[PDB]
Amino acid sequence: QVQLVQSGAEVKKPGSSVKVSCKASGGTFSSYAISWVRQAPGQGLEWMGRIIPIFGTANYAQKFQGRVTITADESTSTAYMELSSLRSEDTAVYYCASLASYSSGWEDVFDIWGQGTMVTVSSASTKGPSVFPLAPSSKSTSGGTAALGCLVKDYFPEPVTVSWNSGALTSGVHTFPAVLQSSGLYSLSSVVTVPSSSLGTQTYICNVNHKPSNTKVDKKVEPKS
Amino acid sequence: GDIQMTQSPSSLSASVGDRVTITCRASQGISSWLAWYQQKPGKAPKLLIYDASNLETGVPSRFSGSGSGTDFTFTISSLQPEDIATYYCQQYDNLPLTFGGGTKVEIKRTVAAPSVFIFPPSDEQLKSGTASVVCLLNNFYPREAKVQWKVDNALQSGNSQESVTEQDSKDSTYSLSSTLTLSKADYEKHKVYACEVTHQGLSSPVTKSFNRGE
Amino acid sequence: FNATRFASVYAWNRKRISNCVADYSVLYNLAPFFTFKCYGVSPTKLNDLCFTNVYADSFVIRGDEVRQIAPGQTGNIADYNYKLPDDFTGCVIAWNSNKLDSKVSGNYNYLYRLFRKSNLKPFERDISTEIYQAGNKPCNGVAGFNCYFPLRSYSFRPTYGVGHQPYRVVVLSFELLHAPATVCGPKKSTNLVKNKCVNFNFNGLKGTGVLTESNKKFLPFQQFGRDIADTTDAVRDPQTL
Amino acid sequence: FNATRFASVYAWNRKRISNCVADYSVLYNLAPFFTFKCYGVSPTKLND
Amino acid sequence: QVQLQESGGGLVQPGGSLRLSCAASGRTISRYAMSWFRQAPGKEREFVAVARRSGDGAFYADSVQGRFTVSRDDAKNTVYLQMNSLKPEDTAVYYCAIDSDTFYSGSYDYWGQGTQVTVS
Ligand SMILES: *[C@@H]1O[C@H](CO)[C@@H](O)[C@H](O)[C@H]1NC(C)=O
């Protein structure tokens, strides 16, 4: 068997340079070569360059020539790629796949891929979130149920995880994709629908976690009339 | 110059069990050096068709493809629930590889009316000197619907942000929300906040609003 | 011949051909079939012969390197990637494929070894690519002057001259042993004339004589008899046995 | 190869040789020479 | 304003099939999709079907998906509708409407004219 494993998400300011890696395991390194693919939020795939470590030949896409550099070694059985002078547009996911079309029959089709590595470029730095519940109105209730929600704001960087009753409540739970402020801080929203009679009699709480700094936050939700 | 591919149509919608097709084209006739990928939202791409007309190991017979020269076609014999993803064509006639624009396919269903809700801000938020109002559309279909702001019965624009979700795998519906933001002074300037909605399955436009004292 | 994906000179692809009616006019009639060299047989006579088995080997090599694809030759291809028997009987067909198998500083699909511990036996194949050690030092990785990597790529670039342009080659190995014949030409079979001096052609066995109902008990596996001096004394009819 | 008088890549040195025996097992293959590579011609052909 | 008209309908027998048509002239036929609507006497509106520019199949609500068929004719600026095995629910007035939004996936509902159906 053959597998590739990538590093965790990395973040740094615009104008800096980002290093990424992905372990190569199984089989033999002499039979491996690596590529690099991009996936920024909300569109399709994109390709950066190609390397054959054992042949020493590398190539980069015209839109990445000079800015990107690819290296690999057999002692660690790993490939390293670097990009310099990041723009805000460089916020994307990095993918390395066992290189393709290298020989008789194997085709320029990426067969085996890594798990990925998210990178974002912003002027903000690591800090915790701000949380405040929503106050749903009684008159807005429909179908004998009330919608409850919480907001997470002013945090950076992602990931951020949100759950209701620390995961004990899942029916009617809805969450929206995050957004990025002009200040460089991310935001999130989540809601849950429950019967108007169950609330109050049973406690409902929204739980949040900013894993990059591991700040645990939980807060209660209560409608008003 | 670099070879650029065009994928048509850009979007698709078909119910489970229906025949669907996807096409990808190149500017100049490539020597059948094309492949196809499947990528779930945020997941690693999966190889399905490697040669112009061959299937990868373990790929179901549900998938097939053919084509040569400039234009190629990718067909599925029967759509299935797992098919909510984006498929990309990859051309490798020459090293300057390009990736297709990607075709997004979703599950078709019948019209579903939205559930409409409105959120007023809380005191903890107001004490920061800023205020916001959130309007919600939940579990509706087709794709999108309008959300409009009519604070003080007067239309407003440019002062709100919107976020939307993916397809709901449990019922193939969608949800949408809009968030209005204002400063405390401008927040107090107004006296009525209203969110208006219009959707295909509704008998008439829907309005949700609240006054300052409630 | 139309296989869009040909194999490298090393780990060449071979297809076993049997039980077919072979028409070679579709091949040598085409102009782009640049070279049609046959050993032990002529291209004109192929359609009139029968073969017990046919093996079709294919690969991609340099344009000037096709000289090495011949019996008893010596060199990189003739010794370490593909060697033909000295008494090889068959045909070697090659043609240019630069338009199909070339990319500027690319075309890494086709690989070839440069040296081997021992010369490959005829029709021998070696898929392994393990690092070649110098013998005087145990090794597990590439180390330059020792621990060599055997395989290397042509790197066909359209800018190359004809001497280095990729050439698409196929080798048709034939076996001319007597019946049973699995591959035969499109020659039409006539009626069986008996008890008369006639010219006969039994699966390419041409001669003149009188055909008579034999009374010698051939075993089921025997389909052709010989007398003293290896002369053919009896034969079983391919149409009615 | 042991002189190290090259001192630069610009205006690199070149040599022509005749009437000798080239023992490549020693030439350009002692301990200091860490890496090696070849193109077109195998290392064995150098000796033979 | 934009003109519009329908044809067909009228008294029918339950359990049969019915045809309807709608057409327009002198204005663009693509940027707004042509849809159908229904209204029971003194009750709320119900959307029936609509056909887009691409003509990729049909589109229905819950109550009409299993009994209706729709089609459009760009070369003639007309649209047709189908009903199979009419039911007691088929005592109502339909309407021909345009999804009045420029090249939009959704729609703004506006109806120009309608006709009656009555199962006897
Ligand atoms: C030879 O082929 C013909 C035509 O198909 C058939 O009628 C006949 O039985 C065959 N004879 C033998 C011995 O196969």
Residue numbers in the entry:
A (entry chain U): 1 to 225
B (entry chain V): 267 to 480
C (entry chain A): 345 to 585
D (entry chain B): 345 to 392
E (entry chain W): 10 to 129
Sentences from the paper on this structure:
pmcThe Omicron variant of SARS-CoV-2, the causative virus of COVID-19, was initially reported from South Africa in November 2021, and quickly became the dominant strain worldwide. Compared to the original wildtype (WT) strain of SARS-CoV-2, Omicron has 60 amino acid mutations, of which 37 mutations are in the spike protein, the target of most COVID-19 vaccines and therapeutic antibodies. 15 mutations are in the RBD, which contains the ACE2 binding site as well as the epitopes for 90% of antibodies induced by infection or vaccination. We report the structures of the Omicron spike trimer on its own or in complex with ACE2 or an anti-Omicron antibody.
A broad-spectrum therapeutic antibody, JMB2002, which has completed a Phase 1 clinical trial, maintains neutralizing activity against Omicron. The EM density map reveals the binding of 2 Fab molecules to two RBDs (one up and one down) of the trimeric spike. Within the Fab-spike trimer structure, both Fabs bind to the same region in their respective RBD. The up-down RBD-RBD interactions within the spike trimer are conserved in these complexes. The L452R mutation in the Delta variant is at the center of the binding epitope of JMB2002 and this mutation would clash with Y102 from the heavy chain of the Fab, thus providing an explanation for its loss of potency against the Delta variant. In addition, the binding site of the JMB2002 Fab on the RBD is distinct from the epitopes for previously defined class I to class IV antibodies, thus JMB2002 represents a new class of antibody against the spike trimer.
